[PDB]
Amino acid sequence: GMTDCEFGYIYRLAQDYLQCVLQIPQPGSGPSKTSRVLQNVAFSVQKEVEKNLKSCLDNVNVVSVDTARTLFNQVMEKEFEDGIINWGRIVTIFAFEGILIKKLLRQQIAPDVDTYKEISYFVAEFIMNNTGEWIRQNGGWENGFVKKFEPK
Amino acid sequence: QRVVHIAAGLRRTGDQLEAYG
DSSP, X not given: OOGGGSHHHHHHHHHHHHHHHTTOOOSSSOOOHHHHHHHHHHHHHHHHHHHHTHHHHTTOOOOSHXXXXXXXXXXXXXXXXXXXXXXXXXXXXXXXXXXXXXXXXXXXXXXXXXXXXXXXXXXXXXXXXXXXXXXXXXXXXXXXXXXXXXXO | OHHHHHHXXXXXXXXXXXXXX
């Protein structure tokens, strides 16, 4: 409900999206309705950004989780420096973590299967600390995000 | 500069999605 702006919920969203990108959907009850809606819109954004920024993205080597974290935080800082938060921008956070995990899969110097869990963690830390209050004031994931992006 | 360019592209795509999606 309203607690969906807390770290655990956001972490699960970020982890679900990376597992989608990596094609490792996990067994069990399956992703939440929110996560299902997010995966479609974020993937559409991710493919658009991959095409639009292809020349730039091919000139960055994401060789470690620490490089991924620093780059993610650098990019997020500049993306959000104007103080504007909206749902479209929040979607691009997930799209960008999907871009990072794909590069890591190809370029990580010492590959480690738990890496996407570390990416999910620093993504959730950014979303919660920098947009969590806005998310709450705008209905959370269930009453804000899903209402904007679910099928009509 | 690569950080600035990526951030600006994400911002532009996000603001477009906000206004249309």
